[PDB]
Design a protein around this motif. Structure first.
Motif, PDB file in Angstrom:
ATOM      1  N   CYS A   1      10.096   1.080   9.861  1.00 12.68           N
ATOM      2  CA  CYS A   1      10.156  -0.200  10.528  1.00 12.68           C
ATOM      3  C   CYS A   1      10.498  -1.276   9.517  1.00 12.68           C
ATOM      4  N   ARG A   2      11.554  -2.035   9.805  1.00 10.54           N
ATOM      5  CA  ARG A   2      11.760  -3.320   9.161  1.00 10.54           C
ATOM      6  C   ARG A   2      11.499  -4.348  10.250  1.00 10.54           C
ATOM      7  N   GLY A   3      10.340  -4.991  10.187  1.00 16.45           N
ATOM      8  CA  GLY A   3       9.918  -5.873  11.262  1.00 16.45           C
ATOM      9  C   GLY A   3       9.137  -7.071  10.773  1.00 16.45           C
TER      10      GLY A   3
ATOM     11  N   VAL B   1       3.674   7.428   2.146  1.00 14.78           N
ATOM     12  CA  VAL B   1       3.358   6.153   2.795  1.00 14.78           C
ATOM     13  C   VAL B   1       3.846   5.039   1.878  1.00 14.78           C
ATOM     14  N   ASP B   2       4.686   4.142   2.398  1.00 16.33           N
ATOM     15  CA  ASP B   2       5.184   3.015   1.611  1.00 16.33           C
ATOM     16  C   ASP B   2       5.187   1.801   2.537  1.00 16.33           C
ATOM     17  N   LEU B   3       4.196   0.933   2.364  1.00 13.81           N
ATOM     18  CA  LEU B   3       4.017  -0.226   3.231  1.00 13.81           C
ATOM     19  C   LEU B   3       4.137  -1.497   2.410  1.00 13.81           C
TER      20      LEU B   3
ATOM     21  N   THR C   1      18.286   1.892   9.317  1.00 13.08           N
ATOM     22  CA  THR C   1      19.123   2.676   8.419  1.00 13.08           C
ATOM     23  C   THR C   1      18.675   2.487   6.974  1.00 13.08           C
ATOM     24  N   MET C   2      18.751   3.557   6.193  1.00  8.34           N
ATOM     25  CA  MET C   2      18.374   3.507   4.786  1.00  8.34           C
ATOM     26  C   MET C   2      19.554   3.082   3.930  1.00  8.34           C
ATOM     27  N   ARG C   3      19.287   2.307   2.879  1.00 11.78           N
ATOM     28  CA  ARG C   3      20.338   1.813   1.990  1.00 11.78           C
ATOM     29  C   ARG C   3      20.316   2.422   0.580  1.00 11.78           C
ATOM     30  N   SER C   4      19.260   3.184   0.288  1.00 14.66           N
ATOM     31  CA  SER C   4      19.055   3.826  -1.013  1.00 14.66           C
ATOM     32  C   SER C   4      18.838   5.327  -0.861  1.00 14.66           C
ATOM     33  N   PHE C   5      17.886   5.687  -0.012  1.00 13.55           N
ATOM     34  CA  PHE C   5      17.568   7.094   0.216  1.00 13.55           C
ATOM     35  C   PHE C   5      18.568   7.740   1.180  1.00 13.55           C
ATOM     36  N   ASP C   6      18.579   9.065   1.178  1.00 13.75           N
ATOM     37  CA  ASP C   6      19.371   9.858   2.098  1.00 13.75           C
ATOM     38  C   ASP C   6      18.412  10.357   3.174  1.00 13.75           C
TER      39      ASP C   6
ATOM     40  N   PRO D   1      14.140   2.273  -4.922  1.00 15.69           N
ATOM     41  CA  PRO D   1      14.513   0.924  -4.491  1.00 15.69           C
ATOM     42  C   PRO D   1      13.579  -0.152  -5.053  1.00 15.69           C
ATOM     43  N   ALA D   2      12.582   0.230  -5.851  1.00 11.50           N
ATOM     44  CA  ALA D   2      11.511  -0.703  -6.224  1.00 11.50           C
ATOM     45  C   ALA D   2      11.573  -1.247  -7.652  1.00 11.50           C
ATOM     46  N   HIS D   3      12.449  -0.691  -8.485  1.00  9.98           N
ATOM     47  CA  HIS D   3      12.513  -1.091  -9.891  1.00  9.98           C
ATOM     48  C   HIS D   3      12.650  -2.603 -10.074  1.00  9.98           C
TER      49      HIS D   3
ATOM     50  N   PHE E   1       0.869  -1.157   0.000  1.00  7.08           N
ATOM     51  CA  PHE E   1       0.000   0.000   0.000  1.00  7.08           C
ATOM     52  C   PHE E   1       0.912   1.213   0.000  1.00  7.08           C
ATOM     53  N   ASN E   2       0.687   2.113  -0.947  1.00  8.98           N
ATOM     54  CA  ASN E   2       1.585   3.243  -1.121  1.00  8.98           C
ATOM     55  C   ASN E   2       0.776   4.466  -1.498  1.00  8.98           C
ATOM     56  N   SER E   3       1.136   5.627  -0.948  1.00  8.36           N
ATOM     57  CA  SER E   3       0.437   6.853  -1.315  1.00  8.36           C
ATOM     58  C   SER E   3       1.335   8.056  -1.120  1.00  8.36           C
ATOM     59  N   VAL E   4       1.192   9.030  -2.018  1.00 15.73           N
ATOM     60  CA  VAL E   4       1.880  10.311  -1.875  1.00 15.73           C
ATOM     61  C   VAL E   4       0.898  11.438  -2.153  1.00 15.73           C
ATOM     62  N   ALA E   5       0.904  12.429  -1.271  1.00 16.38           N
ATOM     63  CA  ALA E   5       0.085  13.648  -1.406  1.00 16.38           C
ATOM     64  C   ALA E   5       0.984  14.835  -1.698  1.00 16.38           C
TER      65      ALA E   5
END
Ligand SMILES: C=CC1=C(C)/C(=C/c2[nH]c(/C=C3N=C(/C=C4\NC(=O)C(C)=C4C=C)C(C)=C\3CCC(=O)O)c(CCC(=O)O)c2C)NC1=O
Length: 233
Positions: free
Chosen positions: A149-151, A85-87, A132-137, A206-208, A68-72
Protein backbone atom coordinates in the motif's frame (compact mmCIF):
# COMPACT_ATOMS: atom_id res chain seq x y z
CA UNK A 1 3.88 6.30 16.35
CA UNK A 2 1.68 4.57 18.88
CA UNK A 3 0.40 2.21 16.22
CA UNK A 4 3.96 1.25 15.29
CA UNK A 5 4.84 0.72 18.95
CA UNK A 6 1.89 -1.65 19.30
CA UNK A 7 3.15 -3.74 16.38
CA UNK A 8 6.60 -3.97 17.94
CA UNK A 9 5.19 -5.00 21.30
CA UNK A 10 2.80 -7.54 19.85
CA UNK A 11 5.65 -9.11 17.86
CA UNK A 12 7.97 -9.07 20.86
CA UNK A 13 5.24 -10.42 23.15
CA UNK A 14 4.47 -13.16 20.63
CA UNK A 15 8.14 -14.02 20.35
CA UNK A 16 8.42 -14.17 24.13
CA UNK A 17 5.30 -16.32 24.57
CA UNK A 18 6.90 -18.71 22.08
CA UNK A 19 10.15 -19.09 24.03
CA UNK A 20 12.15 -16.48 22.15
CA UNK A 21 15.12 -14.78 23.80
CA UNK A 22 17.16 -11.65 22.97
CA UNK A 23 20.48 -11.78 21.12
CA UNK A 24 23.23 -9.14 21.04
CA UNK A 25 23.74 -6.97 17.97
CA UNK A 26 27.11 -5.92 16.54
CA UNK A 27 28.31 -3.00 18.66
CA UNK A 28 27.06 0.35 17.39
CA UNK A 29 24.20 -1.13 15.35
CA UNK A 30 21.64 -1.64 18.13
CA UNK A 31 20.89 2.07 18.35
CA UNK A 32 21.93 5.12 16.36
CA UNK A 33 20.89 8.71 17.06
CA UNK A 34 20.95 11.34 14.33
CA UNK A 35 23.30 14.22 15.08
CA UNK A 36 20.95 16.36 12.99
CA UNK A 37 17.47 14.88 12.60
CA UNK A 38 16.47 14.13 16.18
CA UNK A 39 15.98 10.67 14.68
CA UNK A 40 16.53 7.45 16.60
CA UNK A 41 16.81 3.97 15.16
CA UNK A 42 16.69 0.93 17.40
CA UNK A 43 17.12 -2.70 16.45
CA UNK A 44 16.72 -6.14 17.98
CA UNK A 45 17.75 -9.72 17.28
CA UNK A 46 15.85 -12.72 18.64
CA UNK A 47 16.47 -16.42 19.03
CA UNK A 48 12.97 -17.67 18.17
CA UNK A 49 12.38 -21.42 18.15
CA UNK A 50 12.25 -22.64 14.54
CA UNK A 51 14.05 -19.58 13.21
CA UNK A 52 17.78 -19.11 12.69
CA UNK A 53 17.52 -15.30 12.64
CA UNK A 54 14.82 -12.75 13.44
CA UNK A 55 15.45 -9.02 13.28
CA UNK A 56 13.29 -6.04 14.22
CA UNK A 57 13.90 -2.33 13.66
CA UNK A 58 12.02 0.72 14.90
CA UNK A 59 12.87 4.21 13.69
CA UNK A 60 11.44 7.19 15.56
CA UNK A 61 12.04 10.51 13.78
CA UNK A 62 8.93 12.30 14.97
CA UNK A 63 6.57 13.70 12.35
CA UNK A 64 9.28 13.30 9.73
CA UNK A 65 9.36 9.52 9.83
CA UNK A 66 8.19 6.42 11.65
CA UNK A 67 9.44 2.97 10.64
CA UNK A 68 8.69 -0.53 11.76
CA UNK A 69 10.53 -3.31 9.96
CA UNK A 70 11.08 -7.00 10.61
CA UNK A 71 12.38 -10.08 8.82
CA UNK A 72 12.15 -13.70 10.02
CA UNK A 73 14.56 -16.32 8.65
CA UNK A 74 13.37 -19.89 9.29
CA UNK A 75 15.85 -22.53 10.34
CA UNK A 76 17.33 -24.18 7.25
CA UNK A 77 15.29 -27.35 7.79
CA UNK A 78 12.22 -25.30 6.95
CA UNK A 79 11.97 -24.09 3.35
CA UNK A 80 8.91 -21.95 4.08
CA UNK A 81 8.76 -18.26 3.27
CA UNK A 82 10.48 -15.57 5.25
CA UNK A 83 8.35 -12.99 7.00
CA UNK A 84 8.95 -9.50 5.63
CA UNK A 85 7.43 -6.36 7.12
CA UNK A 86 8.40 -2.84 6.00
CA UNK A 87 6.14 -0.06 7.30
CA UNK A 88 6.87 3.63 6.81
CA UNK A 89 4.94 6.73 7.81
CA UNK A 90 6.07 10.13 6.47
CA UNK A 91 4.30 12.74 8.58
CA UNK A 92 5.06 15.75 6.38
CA UNK A 93 3.26 14.18 3.43
CA UNK A 94 0.76 12.12 5.47
CA UNK A 95 2.07 9.23 3.43
CA UNK A 96 1.98 5.54 4.31
CA UNK A 97 4.15 2.95 2.62
CA UNK A 98 3.18 -0.46 3.97
CA UNK A 99 4.53 -3.75 2.70
CA UNK A 100 3.80 -7.10 4.31
CA UNK A 101 4.68 -10.38 2.62
CA UNK A 102 5.57 -13.97 3.14
CA UNK A 103 8.65 -13.74 0.94
CA UNK A 104 8.95 -17.02 -1.01
CA UNK A 105 12.27 -18.78 -1.61
CA UNK A 106 10.98 -19.95 -5.02
CA UNK A 107 8.05 -19.18 -7.33
CA UNK A 108 7.19 -22.82 -8.06
CA UNK A 109 3.43 -23.44 -8.25
CA UNK A 110 3.56 -26.27 -5.70
CA UNK A 111 5.45 -24.11 -3.22
CA UNK A 112 3.00 -21.23 -3.60
CA UNK A 113 0.06 -23.65 -3.25
CA UNK A 114 1.63 -25.13 -0.12
CA UNK A 115 2.28 -21.95 1.81
CA UNK A 116 -0.01 -19.13 0.73
CA UNK A 117 -3.60 -20.00 1.71
CA UNK A 118 -3.43 -17.69 4.72
CA UNK A 119 -1.91 -14.76 2.88
CA UNK A 120 -4.39 -15.13 0.03
CA UNK A 121 -7.16 -14.89 2.64
CA UNK A 122 -5.56 -11.88 4.33
CA UNK A 123 -5.20 -10.17 0.95
CA UNK A 124 -8.94 -10.63 0.39
CA UNK A 125 -9.84 -9.42 3.91
CA UNK A 126 -7.89 -6.15 3.75
CA UNK A 127 -8.35 -4.86 0.19
CA UNK A 128 -7.68 -1.25 1.13
CA UNK A 129 -4.07 -2.30 1.80
CA UNK A 130 -2.37 -2.36 -7.23
CA UNK A 131 0.95 -0.70 -6.42
CA UNK A 132 3.92 -1.08 -8.75
CA UNK A 133 7.47 -1.56 -7.48
CA UNK A 134 10.25 0.77 -8.66
CA UNK A 135 13.28 -1.03 -7.15
CA UNK A 136 12.35 -4.62 -6.38
CA UNK A 137 11.22 -7.27 -8.86
CA UNK A 138 7.72 -8.50 -7.91
CA UNK A 139 8.62 -12.00 -9.11
CA UNK A 140 11.80 -12.37 -7.08
CA UNK A 141 11.40 -12.95 -3.35
CA UNK A 142 7.85 -11.52 -3.28
CA UNK A 143 4.53 -13.30 -3.60
CA UNK A 144 1.43 -12.32 -5.58
CA UNK A 145 -0.56 -11.88 -2.35
CA UNK A 146 1.59 -9.35 -0.49
CA UNK A 147 -0.09 -6.37 1.08
CA UNK A 148 1.51 -3.39 -0.68
CA UNK A 149 0.00 0.00 0.00
CA UNK A 150 1.11 3.49 -0.88
CA UNK A 151 -1.62 5.42 0.89
CA UNK A 152 -2.47 7.80 3.70
CA UNK A 153 -3.89 8.28 7.17
CA UNK A 154 -7.09 6.31 6.56
CA UNK A 155 -5.13 3.18 5.61
CA UNK A 156 -2.63 3.65 8.42
CA UNK A 157 -5.28 4.15 11.07
CA UNK A 158 -8.23 2.00 9.99
CA UNK A 159 -6.85 -1.03 8.16
CA UNK A 160 -3.16 -1.46 9.00
CA UNK A 161 -3.55 -2.27 12.73
CA UNK A 162 -5.88 -5.26 12.34
CA UNK A 163 -4.08 -6.33 9.16
CA UNK A 164 -0.71 -6.44 10.89
CA UNK A 165 -2.07 -8.61 13.71
CA UNK A 166 -3.81 -10.91 11.23
CA UNK A 167 -0.66 -11.09 9.07
CA UNK A 168 1.49 -11.96 12.10
CA UNK A 169 -0.94 -14.65 13.29
CA UNK A 170 -1.02 -16.10 9.75
CA UNK A 171 2.78 -16.21 9.72
CA UNK A 172 2.94 -18.13 13.01
CA UNK A 173 0.21 -20.46 11.65
CA UNK A 174 2.28 -20.98 8.50
CA UNK A 175 5.34 -21.92 10.57
CA UNK A 176 3.40 -24.14 12.95
CA UNK A 177 1.73 -25.96 10.05
CA UNK A 178 5.20 -26.62 8.61
CA UNK A 179 6.50 -28.38 11.72
CA UNK A 180 7.43 -31.98 10.92
CA UNK A 181 6.28 -31.64 7.29
CA UNK A 182 8.91 -32.59 4.70
CA UNK A 183 10.69 -29.66 3.10
CA UNK A 184 11.01 -29.96 -0.66
CA UNK A 185 14.16 -27.80 -0.64
CA UNK A 186 16.92 -29.28 1.51
CA UNK A 187 18.90 -27.33 4.13
CA UNK A 188 21.98 -26.58 1.97
CA UNK A 189 19.82 -25.00 -0.70
CA UNK A 190 17.52 -23.23 1.81
CA UNK A 191 20.71 -21.56 3.05
CA UNK A 192 21.80 -20.63 -0.46
CA UNK A 193 18.35 -19.18 -1.20
CA UNK A 194 18.11 -17.23 2.07
CA UNK A 195 21.59 -15.83 1.52
CA UNK A 196 20.63 -14.91 -2.02
CA UNK A 197 17.59 -13.13 -0.53
CA UNK A 198 20.03 -10.90 1.39
CA UNK A 199 22.11 -10.42 -1.73
CA UNK A 200 19.08 -9.49 -3.85
CA UNK A 201 17.56 -7.23 -1.22
CA UNK A 202 20.81 -5.36 -0.62
CA UNK A 203 21.20 -4.93 -4.42
CA UNK A 204 17.69 -3.41 -4.74
CA UNK A 205 17.89 -1.47 -1.44
CA UNK A 206 15.51 1.51 -1.69
CA UNK A 207 16.48 2.82 1.77
CA UNK A 208 20.16 3.83 1.51
CA UNK A 209 19.19 7.44 0.82
CA UNK A 210 16.97 7.66 3.90
CA UNK A 211 19.55 5.93 6.10
CA UNK A 212 22.43 8.07 4.84
CA UNK A 213 20.44 11.26 5.41
CA UNK A 214 19.67 10.41 9.05
CA UNK A 215 22.76 8.46 10.11
CA UNK A 216 25.57 8.97 7.61
CA UNK A 217 27.09 6.86 4.85
CA UNK A 218 29.37 4.69 7.00
CA UNK A 219 26.81 3.63 9.58
CA UNK A 220 24.19 3.07 6.89
CA UNK A 221 26.51 0.70 5.01
CA UNK A 222 27.44 -1.25 8.14
CA UNK A 223 23.76 -1.52 9.02
CA UNK A 224 22.82 -2.72 5.52
CA UNK A 225 25.55 -5.33 5.15
CA UNK A 226 26.12 -6.49 8.75
CA UNK A 227 22.58 -6.42 10.14
CA UNK A 228 19.89 -6.05 7.46
CA UNK A 229 21.30 -8.32 4.79
CA UNK A 230 24.30 -10.06 6.36
CA UNK A 231 24.96 -12.42 3.42
CA UNK A 232 25.44 -9.35 1.20
CA UNK A 233 28.70 -7.45 0.80
C1 LIG B 1 15.03 -0.84 8.69
C2 LIG B 1 14.96 -1.26 7.49
C3 LIG B 1 14.42 -0.64 6.28
C4 LIG B 1 13.84 0.59 6.12
C5 LIG B 1 13.65 1.60 7.16
C6 LIG B 1 13.40 0.70 4.70
C7 LIG B 1 12.85 1.78 4.07
C8 LIG B 1 12.20 1.80 2.74
N1 LIG B 1 11.58 0.79 2.15
C9 LIG B 1 11.04 1.21 0.94
C10 LIG B 1 10.35 0.49 -0.01
C11 LIG B 1 9.92 -0.83 -0.10
N2 LIG B 1 10.07 -1.90 0.83
C12 LIG B 1 9.47 -2.97 0.34
C13 LIG B 1 9.44 -4.26 0.93
C14 LIG B 1 10.32 -4.67 1.85
N3 LIG B 1 11.50 -4.04 2.11
C15 LIG B 1 12.20 -4.76 3.05
O1 LIG B 1 13.28 -4.47 3.52
C16 LIG B 1 11.40 -5.95 3.41
C17 LIG B 1 11.80 -6.97 4.41
C18 LIG B 1 10.27 -5.94 2.66
C19 LIG B 1 9.19 -6.94 2.75
C20 LIG B 1 8.05 -6.97 2.17
C21 LIG B 1 8.95 -2.67 -1.00
C22 LIG B 1 8.25 -3.61 -1.91
C23 LIG B 1 9.22 -1.34 -1.23
C24 LIG B 1 8.87 -0.53 -2.49
C25 LIG B 1 10.17 -0.34 -3.29
C26 LIG B 1 9.94 -0.38 -4.76
O2 LIG B 1 9.25 0.55 -5.24
O3 LIG B 1 10.50 -1.29 -5.42
C27 LIG B 1 11.31 2.58 0.79
C28 LIG B 1 10.88 3.46 -0.40
C29 LIG B 1 9.45 4.01 -0.17
C30 LIG B 1 8.61 3.97 -1.40
O4 LIG B 1 8.67 2.93 -2.10
O5 LIG B 1 7.88 4.96 -1.63
C31 LIG B 1 12.00 2.97 1.93
C32 LIG B 1 12.51 4.34 2.21
N4 LIG B 1 13.80 -0.49 4.07
C33 LIG B 1 14.39 -1.31 5.00
O6 LIG B 1 14.85 -2.44 4.79
Amino acid sequence: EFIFDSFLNELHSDITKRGGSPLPLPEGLEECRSSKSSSVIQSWLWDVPGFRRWRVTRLDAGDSLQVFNSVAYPDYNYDHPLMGVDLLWFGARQKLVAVLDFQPLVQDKDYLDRYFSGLKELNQRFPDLEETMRSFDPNQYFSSWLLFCRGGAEQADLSLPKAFSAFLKAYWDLHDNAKSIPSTIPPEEVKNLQDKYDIYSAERDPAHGLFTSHFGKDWSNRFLHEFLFPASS
